[PDB]
């Protein structure tokens, strides 16, 4: 009596904690530095407390290279999930920064690339709008649910792994650009026409145009254009989230 076998409880509560905390430190909104560290640790601990008793406990000792392989596996799974989720916000940030750069908002990058003078304020605006939308669509709950679900697909125990699968996540790097253009294709196009229009004005009497009349007009036009374009991101926001989620579901397995 008075056994309280500690190794069994430790091995039951450790690896799910490692995977949950690995997702927490990288998953969007759950990985933002504004949350105190203890809150994140407690959330991981409580989620593991809820989940672990149902799972089959592992018996590999913590003092073995098998434990190191397990820890590497959990870290890989968590960071892969969090990063694949982060790709959508990367795409939204790309689209916003490009709209802002066609605004002429930061012209110093065309002359001094990476010269400590850059303000992608539109990128930040649409990034926080995307975060608000992600909060509204309860994406984080889904993330937690999928973190739990990847066990049935991929159990804690060391399992063999595949290859082109990693490429898929890396190939998801294309989406950030592709979908990014899909968010910027209308407005930039009209801005392009506006610039074309300015060109027609410069084909008249030489000089006396551009850098004096083009910038304010194009700034105001970009502002009101994409202010009107704001209602458009939400269907595209859901499209981006669905793309990331089903890509994750297909490739994680």
């Amino acid at each position: 009596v008075t056994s309280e076998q500690w190794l069994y409880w430790l091995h039951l509560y450790f690896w799910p904690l490692l995977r949950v905390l690995a997702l927490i430190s990288t998953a969007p909104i759950l990985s933002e530095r504004a949350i105190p560290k203890r809150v994140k640790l407690g959330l991981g601990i409580m989620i593991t407390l809820v989940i672990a008793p149902s799972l089959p406990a592992n018996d590999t000792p913590l003092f073995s290279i098998a434990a190191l392989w397990l820890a590497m596996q959990q870290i890989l799974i968590g960071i892969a999930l969090g990063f694949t989720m982060q790709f959508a916000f990367a795409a939204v940030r790309t689209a916003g920064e490009f709209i802002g750069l066609q605004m002429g908002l930061s012209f110093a990058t065309f002359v001094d690339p990476g010269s400590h003078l850059n303000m992608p304020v539109l990128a930040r605006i649409m990034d926080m709008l995307a975060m608000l939308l992600f909060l509204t669509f309860n994406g984080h709950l889904w993330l937690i649910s999928l973190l739990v679900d990847t066990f049935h697909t991929l159990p804690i125990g060391s399992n063999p792994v595949n290859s082109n699968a990693f490429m898929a996540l890396a190939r998801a790097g294309g989406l950030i650009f592709l979908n990014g253009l899909m968010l910027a294709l209308p407005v930039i196009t009209l801005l392009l026409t506006l610039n074309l229009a300015l060109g027609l004005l410069n084909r008249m009497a030489p000089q006396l145009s551009i850098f004096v009349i083009g910038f304010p007009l194009t700034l105001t036009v970009g502002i009101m254009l994409m202010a009107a374009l704001m209602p458009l991101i939400a269907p595209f926001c859901e499209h981006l989230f669905s793309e990331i989620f089903n890509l994750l579901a297909d490739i994680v397995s």
């Binding site: 909104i29 504004a34 409580m46 407390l49 989940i51 303000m119 304020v121």
Partner: protein, 209 residues
């Protein structure tokens, strides 16, 4: 009941988890995240020397959790101190008002998700939800609410920078940093519209609503 040595041991051990109660079961969490986000918004990552924000958050939490603490004291601490309720029942009696506050603010979707993740049976009413389901549901709801509040907070301070950059760009001053110009104007705004009274009242209502 337990022996007096066991009661003293349990009391001393339970005194350890006070930061955990403050962070994961109290209003403190969504009383901070908002402060950190606002500090990130104004462009002064130090400004109110942290400790100042922590003290303000502690006082706000103490003012907000007052009815819950009062109910715990009148229902659990008072009978326990008068030797009417045992030590192992005062905890159970006092965990109920905190659980109810934890519900009044915890969203549903989270409750459904964490009721599904535990493989628990159907929960027809809120009276069947245990603490193992309410705790992380409340935590997630508080995180989401804090982030929503902070992200709607962030908008005007970026609007000002946007208009500042556009105005600077109209005149061709393309090599002037916009952040350095915008920071005094952001401070001026936060001074003018009662920056703190409105935020304090909004957070307090956000709890009592």
């Amino acid at each position: 009941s337990w022996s007096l040595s066991v009661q003293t041991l349990v009391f001393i051990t339970s005194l350890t988890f006070l930061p955990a109660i403050l962070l994961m079961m109290t209003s403190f969490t969504r009383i901070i995240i908002v402060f950190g986000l606002l500090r990130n918004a104004l462009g002064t990552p130090s400004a109110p020397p942290n400790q100042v924000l922590l003290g303000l958050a502690l006082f706000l939490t103490f003012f907000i959790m007052s009815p819950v603490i009062d109910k715990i004291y009148v229902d659990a601490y008072q009978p326990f101190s008068e030797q009417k309720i045992s030590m192992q029942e005062a905890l159970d009696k006092g965990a109920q008002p905190l659980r109810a506050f934890m519900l009044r603010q915890t969203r549903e979707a989270d409750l459904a998700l964490f009721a599904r993740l535990a493989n628990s049976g159907p929960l027809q009413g809120p009276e069947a939800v245990p603490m193992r389901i309410l705790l992380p549901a409340y935590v997630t709801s508080e995180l989401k609410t804090a982030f929503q509040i902070g992200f709607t907070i962030f908008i005007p301070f970026l609007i000002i920078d946007l208009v500042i950059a556009s105005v600077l760009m109209a005149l061709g001053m393309m090599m002037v940093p916009p952040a350095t110009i915008a920071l005094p104007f952001k401070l001026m705004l936060f001074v003018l519209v009662d920056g703190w009274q409105l935020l304090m009242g909004s957070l307090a209502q956000s709890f009592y609503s």
